[model samples]
Target: DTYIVNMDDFQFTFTMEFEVTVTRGGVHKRTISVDNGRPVVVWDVRDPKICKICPDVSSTDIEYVFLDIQKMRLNNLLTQSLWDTQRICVRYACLFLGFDVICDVYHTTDTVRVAYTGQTGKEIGTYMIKSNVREIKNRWRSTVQKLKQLAYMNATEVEFWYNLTTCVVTSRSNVPFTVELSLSAIVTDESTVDCQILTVKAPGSHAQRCYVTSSLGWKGVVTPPSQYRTKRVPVNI
Candidate 1:
């Protein structure tokens, strides 16, 4: 099974500094001058010969080339560098990819709706169980306009429906509000909701508030994925 690597999965940015010594002849060792530090990256720093030889080698196999060092302080430093790359990757994915991450989906017969808000540290005001879970239309709860909808199969109930677009902008199912959701049982046996991010937003003026899920009780100094300027549309507002 070949899972094609989406380079985007590893896309991220960070800063670093480096110092090294080179020797050929005693006189050849002239003190080097500095003009601040130049930007460095993994690709340029990588072993080009290895890439040429094992063109299809996985990162795991390549990692084996990284030896285990004990009295070895240098190995520890470089090992941390690889881990640092992975750590930043997850941090970015956590906030960057999930426009619909807060919302959960399930197979159920009940008709349903949900709400969200611009207000940070808040949550959707709908009752949900193991069976799970859109936008603010209007009328208190999420707002006075109550972004509402019903979860029924007007398409006619078969024991199961194949799929859905839970956050469909064209249908106005995507609303941003607080205290959001509504429920009506769908006689239909099984239905599925697939929440996907169809559009993206640039970091808004108050982009800091773009993460609608502060109600989860966070620690100090939270960061959003704004490194690249493109904030994928996770919410309508």
Candidate 2:
């Protein structure tokens, strides 16, 4: 029986071989081969008098998908309109290719639905089209009424992937444009595991008792701190 599994970059060694046979009065079989296979298992002989042999090695359980060489920037500054749909291919938005699109403003009184849902709605397109700058902030006056409603509705391109225009202001003009379609910071990638697992136990007469385990990790989300910051103590008389 033997075992050695290191993962600081790569190292594996496991060896076990047994086929005891006391003429069928005591027969305990075992076979292990490790060079590029690694899956040995046979460790249970509670000794009724004398029957010993253990083997339960581990190593070479390495998985893949550790990808995160930094991605997901999807910037969107707004303010350059003409109906504001400026470049949002999202790689062929049949609902945003492989998911990551949630711009659903939806304010009402006259018009404001800027839809593009899928944070969990499954797919609901129609990415742009705005025209309600009723406020005199001089902010290009709602970008010149959405560039004259995109040149009097003579717009082109439609079927997702950003061309902008398809919700043409119509909730019965009651008018109330507060203007605030946010999104200035939404970066995400909270993977973890950075590494930790080193168990080495071997120091006994007849030596052989191993049980190494593994399961690499990293799984997002950790936003907790609304209120709980009061820990201070100091006294010197």
Candidate 3:
């Protein structure tokens, strides 16, 4: 029998670039930077489809306080203000998305600071801060606010040197698995960690057939998505 095990803890870093296509303003380039520091970044996930009776769930009149930890309802005051006490860092607003395209007009972000805690847990949650360096210096010198999270990694793929399901290794045939995760639109949130395993059955004695199948499911909330259904035909995620 053969098996694989994770003996140590590790973190994966994701770099993402973005651009927005205005009504006719060409493409405005945007970018994201994530600094999770070994902590799983939370995905701002919600319901896949809005109900037929639901109204336009857009809330555009909101201005997020950069320092209102109370707004996010944090268990510790540190989650809100740790950046002030410790070194300052920034992360892009990473999210899990549905098919419906949601353009983010406001800027929201995630920030976490490590203050020696029990078992060395990071003082964390999620946040909405500005990306403008001009505002960051002044904002840091003075106050706090937060912006609603909008933005998602809608359409993207993870490409590897070997097929995810058919990848194989044999007879000291050491090979490199260069995996590339690319995206033109949408956002990525790493709130949780997902690990997948593929079984390779190649016994020299004989080859046997084993019928197999699989399915996947995810949980969601409300408001993160405004419209659940529309003329979005020929589209399947």
Off by over 4 Å in 3: 1-125, 129-199, 202-207, 215-237
Q: Local distance difference test, per candidate? A: 0.19, 0.18, 0.20
lDDT score of residue 134 within candidate 1:
16
lDDT for each residue of candidate 1 in 11-57, tens digit (9 for 90 to 100): 32111111221111211110100111111112212331221111232
Off by over 4 Å in 1: 1-193, 198-206, 214-222, 229-237
Estimate the overall C-alpha local distance difference test score of candidate 3. 0.20
How well is each residue in 34-140 modelled by candidate 3, as lDDT tens digits? 22121111212121121122122222311123222322332133355443332222222322122111122222224433332121111232222222222222221
lDDT, candidate 2, equals 0.18
**Best by the lDDT measure:** 3
Candidate 2 segments exceeding 4 Å error: 1-102, 105-138, 149-237
Better of 2 and 3 by TM-score: 3
Estimate TM-scores for all models: 0.13, 0.12, 0.15
> What TM-score, to 2 decimals, does candidate 2 have?
0.12
Give the better candidate number (1 or 2) by lDDT: 1
- In angstroms, give how far residue 99 of model 3 lies from its true place: 12
